[PDB]
Design a protein around this ligand. Structure first.
Ligand SMILES: C#CCOc1ccccc1CNCCc1cc(OC)c(N(C)C)cc1OC
Length: 261
């Protein structure tokens, strides 16, 4: 059911930009690209995880395909985090300095920000396909599909998520501070706050459990950590479905487009 919503919401978002040409602004191209990453993640990755859940957490799929699956789950997931990080940076720049942002608000730089995000997503996720496909034990370890290089993993989870997280946590808070510096401004503070709170609460638990697992493997119980990771990956996947409904709620035209289709 999470997979259905995750696919469907992004599918509606991507068409609504095309079917309704009013949302041809530069921002909604970023928003449709984030929807693309989320829908791709829902289509390619998540039913496989549901299948492993049914089959007992053993990888029925061909052996080397396990290597690319994890790679997809890094690239599509890292892209969404980088999309939201760039959204936070650009929206903070818009709030703090609205006039000067309009001078450089041309779409030509907006496309460079897209190429930057989708380039950094590949740059972060380079090792997993080539290394995992070469050595099964690196990414197929324990008989269940899992990425198992501690040295690479603990830094990779950090740069991919925490570095955007501090950029989000230092920009979002500052965006509220700019609004504070009446009713028009303060209404944005709460709506920004809920969006920040959900994605932090839904993304962060997986990563802290992963880093806690790698560091504390000597001093922790494996089974509880495994169950927690099994559920927290689902919650992180729900993070993908979350954003289209947020789009539906605050914007008039997306709501009309989804009501029609
Ligand atoms: C958005 C979204 C997807 O949902 C989410 C959302 C948040 C957390 C987890 C999930 C579940 N996806 C897991 C993806 C993933 C990302 C990684 O960092 C970028 C890494 N490491 C570098 C260790 C491993 C990994 O799992 C293979």
């Amino acid at each position: 059911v999470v997979i259905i919503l995750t696919i469907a919401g992004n599918i509606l978002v991507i068409m609504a930009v095309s079917l309704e040409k009013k949302l041809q602004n530069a921002t909604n191209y970023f928003l449709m690209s984030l929807a693309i990453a989320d829908m791709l993640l829902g289509f390619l990755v998540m039913p496989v995880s549901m299948l492993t859940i049914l089959y007992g957490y053993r990888w029925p799929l061909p052996s080397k395909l396990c290597a690319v699956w994890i790679y997809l789950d890094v690239l599509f997931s890292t892209a969404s985090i980088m999309h939201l990080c760039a959204i936070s940076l650009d929206r903070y720049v818009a709030i703090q300095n609205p006039i000067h942002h309009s001078r450089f608000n041309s779409r030509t730089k907006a496309f460079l920000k897209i190429i930057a995000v989708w380039t950094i997503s590949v740059g972060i996720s380079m090792p997993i396909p080539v290394f995992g496909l070469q050595d099964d034990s690196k990414v197929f370890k324990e008989g269940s599909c899992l990425l198992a290089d501690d040295n690479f993993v603990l830094i990779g989870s950090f740069v991919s998520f925490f570095i955007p997280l501090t950029i989000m946590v230092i920009t979002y808070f500052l965006t509220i501070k700019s609004l504070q510096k009446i009713s028009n401004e303060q209404k944005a503070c709460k709506v920004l706050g809920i969006v920040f709170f959900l994605f932090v609460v839904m993304w962060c638990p997986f990563f802290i459990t992963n880093i806690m697992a790698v560091i504390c493997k000597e001093s922790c119980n494996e089974d509880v950590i495994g169950a927690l990771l099994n559920v927290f990956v689902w919650i992180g996947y729900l993070s993908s479905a979350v954003n289209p409904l947020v789009y539906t709620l605050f914007n008039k035209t997306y709501r009309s487009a989804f009501s029609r289709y």
